[PDB]
């Protein structure tokens, strides 16, 4: 089963974007559905063999085969259309779906959800939940970035470097420990705010409660 | 397709726009 290899995509709250690539076009429309256009070359123009429209919870997948020439927007669907649900999708479409999944995932990891201003830094929790990327942009120039795996740090001088594992955490210049302490305070806070606002949204029935900016630079 | 790279500069303009309200 596909569910055993990746999780279903989520396109909620993602800004529209039309990204051309060498073998494909990917588009996040205004409706938040996600479209993937397959591009083939003939003669001297490029066409679109099939279109994969994915719902916002990617649960319902509409896929169609028109013949259309590439354009500024995705082709409109014909009648030769196939409608599938996530768990009955045949292997032939999995690789494409995993392509859209990895794309959405990367966009989420750079699309802010909660911005938070402290007396020393501008925090930014991204949308790639759970274990979302977490940037701490200290005002003095120091940068910090936390992923489920690596943790990137930069210093004013530009000594850009990275770290692995919890082996070196304690043994470090206590100034950098100060930066990490403030960043973990911010992370706990931002996750708490996300959780409580989400819960009220669970009750609520209207317009989104995210993105959200908190505080201000003095 | 599972070879494709898609992280080029138009996406960089998109990301700039994302962080501009900050």
């Amino acid at each position: 089963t596909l569910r055993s290899i990746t999780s279903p995509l989520v396109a909620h709250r993602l800004k529209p974007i039309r990204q051309k690539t060498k073998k494909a076009v990917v588009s996040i429309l205004d409706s938040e559905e996600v479209c993937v256009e397959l591009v083939k070359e003939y003669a001297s123009q490029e066409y679109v063999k099939e279109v994969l429209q994915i719902s916002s919870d990617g649960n319902t997948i509409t896929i169609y085969y028109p013949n259309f020439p590439l354009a500024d927007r995705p082709p409109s669907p014909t009648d030769n259309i196939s409608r599938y649900s996530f768990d009955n999708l045949p292997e032939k479409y999995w690789r494409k779906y995993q392509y859209a999944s990895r794309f959405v995932q990367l966009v989420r990891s750079k699309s802010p959800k909660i911005t938070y201003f402290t007396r020393y830094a501008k925090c930014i929790l991204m949308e790639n939940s759970p274990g979302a990327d977490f940037e701490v942009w200290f005002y003095d120039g120091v940068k910090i970035h936390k992923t489920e795996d690596f943790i990137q740090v930069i210093e004013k001088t530009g000594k850009s470097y990275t770290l692995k594992s919890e082996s070196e955490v304690n043994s470090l210049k206590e100034e950098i420990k100060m930066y990490m302490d403030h960043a973990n305070e911010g992370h706990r806070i931002c996750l708490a705010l996300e959780s409580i606002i989400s819960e009220e949204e669970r009750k609520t029935r209207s317009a989104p409660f995210f993105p959200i900016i908190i505080g201000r630079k003095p | 397709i599972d070879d494709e790279m898609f992280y080029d500069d138009h996406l960089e303009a998109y990301f700039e726009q994302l962080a501009i309200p900050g």
Binding site: D30, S31, T60, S76, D79, N80, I81, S82, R83, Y84, S85, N88, P90 | -
Partner: protein, 331 residues
């Protein structure tokens, strides 16, 4: 769901539907097929059983059932939808069902019947006009359409499970055909003192209530939660054919529900235009006078039932409707 029995008048009209010679257009150079519903149903059922797929039921849907139940009603005859209650577990069976249907298409031809090589792809690109595969949580069915032109479109739909496509009372009718295909076994034709027992069904509620709605020309539905985009457009077609709501009180609310779900499902005006132009070309191909009356019924409904906060998008769609009128009012 209730159960009723077509009287002799009705059974006769069903027989006329089943023995009516329907022409099927052939996109391209391919000749026009002179088929018949009895023949297609028989061939398809026979080859499905032979191929190992049980066919529990065969039913007649669409406006055809309504034309059977009430002679020369307001609804016309362009629709001829068949439903084959068939189990569809894996995609293998879905592909077999496509191969079987294209093969049974090959079986009706006036001379080149011996062409035992004409392949399923040239047949799809020559005889099939609409193809629809659905295999989701609840919904699970396949649909093959036949050519739409100087004749009537014959639509074969294979339902494993369906989220009960509920609609207006006037098109929720299904007729279980088994009794009439089996009945001919008799050596003589069906007469008034000697007819088969045919059974009608209603896909939601009391069958006798829908029948009453159809005789008195009433508009009604009971599952508005599960209404999607095209309900409003169907509703306006009922309006242009002089059908009235069952109670003027609740229809202002039904109208608001259809309008909101319409804007939720067609937010981009370009998609709206496509949807409308194709709806118009489907239901009013040649009823020229009917088109303007329809467009103005729609405009009236949109204007009265679009909530105030969406007035802006209202004007945009009203303008689309207006532009369509300037075209329907000259040619």
């Amino acid at each position: 769901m209730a159960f009723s029995v077509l009287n002799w008048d009705q059974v006769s009209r069903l027989h006329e539907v089943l023995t009516e010679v329907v022409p099927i257009h052939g996109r391209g150079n391919f000749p026009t097929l002179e088929i018949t519903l009895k023949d297609i149903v028989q061939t398809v059922r026979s080859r499905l059983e032979e191929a190992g797929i049980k066919v529990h039921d065969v039913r007649l849907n669409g406006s055809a059932a309504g034309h059977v139940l009430v002679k020369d009603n307001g609804l016309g005859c362009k629709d001829l939808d068949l439903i084959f209650h068939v189990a569809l577990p894996t995609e293998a069976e879905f592909q077999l069902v496509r191969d079987v249907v294209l093969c049974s298409l090959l079986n009706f031809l006036p001379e080149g019947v011996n062409k035992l090589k004409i392949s399923p792809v040239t047949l799809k690109e020559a005889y099939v006009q609409k193809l629809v595969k659905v295999c989701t949580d609840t919904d699970r069915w396949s649909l093959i359409s036949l050519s739409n032109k100087n004749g009537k479109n014959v639509e074969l739909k294979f339902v494993d499970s369906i989220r009960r496509q509920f609609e207006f009372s006037v098109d929720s009718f299904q007729i279980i055909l088994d009794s009439l295909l089996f009945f001919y076994c008799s050596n003589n034709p069906i007469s008034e003192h000697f007819h088969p027992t045919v059974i009608g069904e209603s896909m939601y509620g009391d069958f006798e209530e829908a029948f009453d709605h159809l005789q008195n020309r009433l508009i009604a539905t009971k599952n508005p939660e599960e209404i999607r985009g095209g309900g409003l457009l169907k509703y306006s077609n009922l309006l242009v054919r002089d059908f009235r709501p069952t109670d003027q009180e609740e229809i202002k609310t039904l109208e608001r529900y259809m309008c909101s779900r319409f804007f939720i499902d067609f937010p981009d005006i370009l998609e709206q235009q496509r949807k409308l132009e194709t709806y118009l070309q489907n239901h009013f191909a040649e009823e020229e006078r009917s088109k303007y009356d329809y467009l103005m019924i729609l405009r009236r409904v949109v204007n009265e039932s679009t909530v105030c906060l969406m007035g802006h998008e209202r004007r945009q769609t009203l303008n689309l409707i207006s532009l369509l009128a300037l075209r329907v009012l000259a040619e």
